[PDB]
């Protein structure tokens, strides 16, 4: 499957298209609005590599109820890629996934 890489540096593979899944009704990728009016077309994938996390998980304005987010940045260039999502309870499946923002990745999905 097609590799997706950081748009800014194009030095790392972050994920592959075979990781894509639909978490809910809105297909594998949809537009979501953050608290300040930024719109992120967020693709959900089971596994991602070559990302670094900032800080600790938060449920604030979570787009996926039952999950907390942690900001995820390219390990090379520190560009914002998306968020790691982690379940806040045991009955959630999957227990973790990544939401990657379309505009941070190449190729364009």
């Amino acid at each position: 499957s097609t590799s997706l890489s950081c748009k800014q540096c194009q030095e790392t593979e972050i994920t592959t298209k075979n990781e894509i899944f639909s978490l809910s009704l809105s297909g594998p990728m949809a537009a979501y609005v953050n608290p300040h009016g930024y719109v992120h077309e967020t693709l959900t994938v089971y596994k991602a590599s070559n990302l670094n996390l900032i800080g600790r998980p938060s449920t604030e304005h979570s787009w996926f109820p039952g999950y907390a987010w942690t900001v995820a940045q390219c390990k090379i260039c520190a560009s914002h890629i998306g968020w790691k999502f982690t379940a806040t309870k045991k009955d959630m499946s999957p227990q973790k996934f990544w939401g990657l923002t379309r505009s941070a990745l190449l190729p364009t999905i």
Binding site: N34, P35, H36, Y38, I54, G55, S58, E60, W69, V71, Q73, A78, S79, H80, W83
Partner: peptide
């Protein structure tokens, strides 16, 4: 511990000066 937040992605920072650079780099 990290009181400064980026309004585009939610990244948090202990130093406001690092927040300012981080916001710039979203461009």
């Amino acid at each position: 511990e990290r009181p400064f937040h980026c309004n585009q992605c939610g990244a948090s920072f202990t130093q406001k000066g690092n927040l300012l650079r981080h916001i710039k780099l979203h461009s």
